[PDB]
Every structure is written in structure tokens, then in C-alpha cells.
Design a protein around this ligand. Structure first.
Ligand SMILES: [Mg+2]
Ligand SMILES: [Mg+2]
Ligand SMILES: [Mg+2]
Ligand SMILES: [Mg+2]
Ligand SMILES: [Mg+2]
Ligand SMILES: [Mg+2]
Ligand SMILES: [Mg+2]
Ligand SMILES: [Mg+2]
Ligand SMILES: [Mg+2]
Ligand SMILES: [Mg+2]
Ligand SMILES: [Mg+2]
Lengths: 88, 106, 14, 129, 55
RNA sequence: CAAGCUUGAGUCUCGUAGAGGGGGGUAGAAUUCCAGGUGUAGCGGUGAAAUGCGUAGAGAUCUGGAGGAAUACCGGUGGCGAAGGCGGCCCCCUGGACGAAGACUGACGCUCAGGUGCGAAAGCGUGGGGAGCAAACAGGAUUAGAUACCCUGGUAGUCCACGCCGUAAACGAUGUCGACUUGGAGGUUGUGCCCUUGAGGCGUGGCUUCCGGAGCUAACGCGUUAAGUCGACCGCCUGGGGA
């Protein structure tokens, strides 16, 4: 996905400590920065339909993880949607 | 940061122009935080098959640890210069510092 | 074969 | 996947009974104890033990005749795709009353022979043939 | 671990006509055999081993 | 509904393998064209011949250059990918798969009618490109006729960009996922320990082929990768022809 400095910092941004890495809100941010990383790639590489499968995997993976926090605790849901720029 | 092994061979009629190209390319690398690991001059070397109607090509082997700034410019100035007839770069696994088997026998 | 398939459409009698 | 764990339990019993296995192991639960303890009290199996509390592992001791299968066949009847329920007088028998039908009611897991004195009905679990 | 520079190893793994000997004859491991193939293809560009016995 | 728990399903790190895709360069044979040199009566092609080429010097050989497309050997029931498929090397961007040690979220899952995208080749639109191969066609044999076969040529197309077309014997002729049930011969890919006493001994996951027991099956065969015993869900068939 990214390097070590980009991965470990965002875990420290949204996690309570360095060990808070398996939570769902971190997993949204790992996919949010990755899709934002691949914005300029697929614009130049529209004939790369095989890497688009990896892109559509992560869009579908982020949608399923947003559905878990929304159905359980909407207070943490309303924080992260505007903090990363979701809901369009 | 990537670890590159850069192989470039020099036209044999300009074999004295080789130490000029060694230290001009090095100053652009080390200024942008680029390390260096191996710099071995081999002299003339017999070819397995002729290339560009020539024989006895000059061989210089390199190892450059540097970011992706040098990978844009250095391969273009190889194609811009007529002295370098073959240019070849490759990505390695680690920063390595070890003499070639050409130097260990010669 | 599945009972849940027959919820959508039963067996078509000729 | 493992969505019907009772049907997964019946799969692990029927295989090792036919393949001459001495003992089998399986992940435990509350309902799997409430079925194997009834089969222990109905002469089909021998003994069961529990192992582990954070990963409950159930074990069953097999039973043979001369190296022959005691439980010849067992049939899952109700399932998560189709639920089966009967009343106190519509309780089906297995082999005209030879085999037992495991029916769980509000008074615990019992047989249809034991449901006559109880007078209840509910969910059919398996035909112990 | 394997490398293209030691041509004395590569001379034992080729023919007189520059053909790459497969792992059936030499009996080497299949992990190195893919690596020895690309190591010759590095050396084939650098004019260290001949292509054919024609030239 | 409420509070949970961790084996399901996920997240991080350290790693390893690979023709995974896209983009940009680059190499050397071979084919054909063209230039030059030496050189002479046939070259070419088939079962046999002819059309065709060549004394303006063919063919053959050597030097030099141009363009085009494909990547010998490696290379193998070998690897990768959801599949069709994917193969010179190198760089850049990027995808999934798998293993080890733990840490962490706490069922976040499975499945899918409409919908959505990919999807061999032929062919279609616009603009390039052009060696070789090659529908239609030209010509010569064959023949009763040759329309086909065979041979000498040859356009569309094969190539690239930009779209559209969405069908195949698109086949493992087996939809996906999970749980279990004796085993071998191997391959590939790792990892843990061991007089390291050798690239070995002992284990142990991922992937894959051939045998084969019980069991199943109409037979063929399948047989821990099931077509064995079961669950979750979906598609599809109802005599042949019409179609
Ligand atoms: Mg990766
Ligand atoms: Mg050529
Ligand atoms: Mg916890
Ligand atoms: Mg047309
Ligand atoms: Mg023809
Ligand atoms: Mg066209
Ligand atoms: Mg069809
Ligand atoms: Mg077959
Ligand atoms: Mg048998
Ligand atoms: Mg078999
Ligand atoms: Mg009909």
C-alpha cells in the first residue's frame, strides 16, 4: 500500500495508541488514503483493467466497513465521514 | 530508497574521457543525498560478439543508492551522449559493497 | 432443488 | 459456512462411526452438549468430555458391535433453510418406533417417547436411526 | 544470491553454441533455474556470452 | 434488544516467489526490400510438373542500410491471474496470492434475481502502419468439372491509437463457500528444529499432477483439490425435430 512512515502515522492519527491498529476506523483510513493515492494513476491508465479490480475491491471493502460503524454507533460514524471527506 | 546497479560501457576511442564522466555524474548524485557503494574501472575488455562495428569495449561498473531524481536525467544523458553505446540499470535487493569477479582476478 | 428457489417461482406445470 | 453447527456435528459422527475411528473431537457449544448427553442416555454413544473454556472443544467416544456401526444412519430434518415444527400428536417416529427423534422443547431436549409423558412439541433436530 | 558477473559459473551452465542447459541434465534446483535463465539474459545484453556458434 | 467472548472473517510488521496488468526505452538473430562487391545457367517449386524469377546477372555468398512483427534455447501435467488468457531484457507506476512471529477490531460473514465492469479471435467506424503470413481474387497443375486440395503471387485483415461489437468446444464439457472422512509416487513454494558433521536428517503450511482403499456412480471414472458423507445460497433443464 504505502511506506512505513505513511502507514504508522495514520494509525497514530486515528488510534488511541500505537497498538490500536486492528480497529475498523483505521481500516477505513487505510483504504481512504489508498484510493486517494490512486486517483491520478487510473486517469492515465484507463486500459489497466486488472489493477482496476484491485481498486474496485478496496471501494467495496470500504463500503462494507462503513456499514458496520453506522449500524452500531453513529457518533463515531459522523466524525469520520467529514474528517476524511465522505458521503459526497 | 532504491538500490541501483548501473552498467554503462564507453566507446573505446574515448577511453581517456572516462574519469571525467565519473566525477561529473557523482556530484549531482551526492548533493541530493545519494550514496555510492562501488566504483570499479576495468579498462578495455574483449566482446563476446561485435556491437556497433567495434571491438575491445571499455567497461565501468557502478552501484548507486539514490532517490528517483537521478533515474530520470541520467538515462537520458546516456542516450544524449554518443560515448556510451550501451546503458543498463537494474534494481537490487540491498545496499551491497563487494568486489566484482573481474577485479578479484585482474 | 432448493426450497428457497421455489419461493420466487414454483415448478412450472406443463 | 458452519451455519448449521448441528449438521456439522452429525457429519463428524457419521464419518468416524463408519471409518472405524475410536474417538472424535469437535467444537463445543451449549446445544451440542444438550444432544450428546441425550444420546449417551439412549445407548448410542459412550461418553463425552469438555476441554477448553476460551475455545470449547467437545469430544465423543464411539461405539461398535463387532467393529460394526451402532449408529447406522442419522438424518438432519430441520435446517436453517427450512424450519420444521410439529405438535404433541404429530410427532414422527423413526423406523416405526425403533429409532428415536430428538425434539427440543421448553422442558429440555428429550425424545418423542419422553414427550408422551411431557405432552409438548417443537423443533425436530435429527432422526437417530 | 546468484549473480551474472561470475561468468565461470555461467560457462558450466551453457553449451558450445550458447544454449542454456536445462535442469534435467545438470540436476540443479528449480529455484535457481529461473534465476540462472535471467542471469544469462542479463549477460547476453552485456556481450559476455555468445548467442549462437554462428558468430 | 442489551452486554460480551474469540476459533470465523479482517488489520499491522518482517519477508519470499511469479509470463499479473499498463506505460516508456532498448538488444540480437531471422524474413523481405534496397545499395555495393565477387561470381554463372539455371533458381524456384512438387508425387511428378507447370505458372513465376533470371544473362538489365538471378539464385548463392559478403559488406552496409531501411522497415515491420514475433521472442529460439531457458521451458517443464512449471508458475501467475476471476476468467479469456499471460513469455527477450531493463526502468517507472500498480494489483492480488502465500508464509513466520505476535499485537489488535470484535461476526464486521456467506450468498446473490435486476444492476455494474472485464471478457479469445473474426468483423464494423475514424486516422495511421505494412515485412512475413493470408478470405475474395489473379495464374498454373490436378480433374469428369477444381469452384477445394497442391504450387507461384496477392488485397482486406493481422500492427498501433481511438471507439463499438460481447459471441466460442469462453471445457475441469464440474457455480461459489465452509465442515469432516485411510493413504502413496512426485512437482512447486516457504518455514521451525537438528552430531551446520554436504545442496542433507526431522517436522510443518500454500499450490499442483498421476495412482488408488472405503464409499458413490448408468457405466466410464471420481475418490482429502470428490463426482464420498452434509449444510448456506443462486442459476438452469422437462421427449427428438420444429428451434
Ligand atoms: Mg505488495
Ligand atoms: Mg533481420
Ligand atoms: Mg478486546
Ligand atoms: Mg469494414
Ligand atoms: Mg490456395
Ligand atoms: Mg480495421
Ligand atoms: Mg453460448
Ligand atoms: Mg476431460
Ligand atoms: Mg478399490
Ligand atoms: Mg483416483
Ligand atoms: Mg420442447
Amino acid at each position: 500500500s504505502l511506506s512505513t512512515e505513511a502507514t504508522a502515522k495514520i494509525v497514530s492519527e486515528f488510534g488511541r495508541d500505537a497498538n490500536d491498529t486492528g480497529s475498523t476506523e483505521v481500516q477505513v483510513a487505510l483504504l481512504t488514503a489508498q484510493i486517494n493515492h490512486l486517483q491520478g494513476h487510473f486517469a492515465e491508465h484507463k486500459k489497466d483493467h486488472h489493477s482496476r479490480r484491485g481498486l474496485l475491491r478496496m471501494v467495496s471493502q470500504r463500503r462494507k466497513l462503513l456499514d458496520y460503524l453506522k449500524r452500531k454507533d453513529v457518533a463515531r460514524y459522523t466524525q469520520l465521514i467529514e474528517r476524511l471527506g465522505l458521503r459526497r | 530508497m532504491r538500490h541501483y546497479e548501473i552498467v554503462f560501457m564507453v566507446h573505446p576511442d574515448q577511453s581517456e574521457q572516462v574519469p571525467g564522466m565519473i566525477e561529473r555524474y557523482t556530484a549531482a548524485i551526492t548533493g541530493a543525498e545519494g550514496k555510492i557503494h562501488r566504483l570499479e574501472d576495468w579498462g578495455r575488455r574483449q566482446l563476446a560478439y561485435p556491437i556497433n562495428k567495434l571491438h575491445k569495449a571499455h567497461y565501468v561498473l557502478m552501484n548507486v543508492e539514490a532517490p528517483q531524481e537521478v533515474i530520470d536525467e541520467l538515462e537520458t544523458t546516456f542516450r544524449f551522449n554518443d560515448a556510451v553505446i550501451r546503458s543498463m540499470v537494474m534494481r537490487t535487493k540491498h545496499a551491497v559493497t563487494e568486489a566484482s569477479p573481474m577485479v578479484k582476478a585482474k | 432443488a432448493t426450497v428457497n428457489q421455489l419461493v420466487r417461482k414454483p415448478r412450472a406445470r406443463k | 459456512s458452519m451455519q448449521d453447527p448441528i449438521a456439522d456435528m452429525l457429519t463428524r459422527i457419521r464419518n468416524g462411526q463408519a471409518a472405524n475411528k475410536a474417538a472424535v473431537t469437535m467444537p463445543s457449544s451449549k446445544l451440542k452438549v444438550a444432544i450428546a448427553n441425550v444420546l449417551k442416555e439412549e445407548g448410542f454413544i459412550e461418553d463425552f468430555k469438555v476441554e477448553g473454556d476460551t475455545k470449547p472443544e467437545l469430544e465423543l467416544t464411539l461405539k461398535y458391535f463387532q467393529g460394526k456401526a451402532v449408529v447406522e444412519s442419522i438424518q438432519r430434518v430441520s435446517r436453517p433453510g427450512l424450519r420444521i415444527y410439529k405438535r404433541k400428536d404429530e410427532l414422527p417416529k423413526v423406523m416405526a418406533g425403533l429409532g428415536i427423534a430428538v425434539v427440543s422443547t421448553s422442558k429440555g431436549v428429550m425424545t418423542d417417547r419422553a414427550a408422551r409423558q411431557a405432552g409438548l412439541g417443537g423443533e425436530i433436530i435429527c432422526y437417530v436411526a | 544470491e546468484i549473480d551474472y558477473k561470475d561468468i565461470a559459473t555461467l560457462k558450466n551452465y551453457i553449451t558450445e553454441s550458447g544454449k542454456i542447459v536445462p535442469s534435467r541434465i545438470t540436476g540443479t534446483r528449480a529455484k535457481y533455474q529461473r534465476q540462472l535463465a535471467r542471469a544469462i539474459k542479463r549477460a547476453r545484453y552485456l556481450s559476455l556470452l555468445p548467442y549462437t556458434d554462428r558468430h
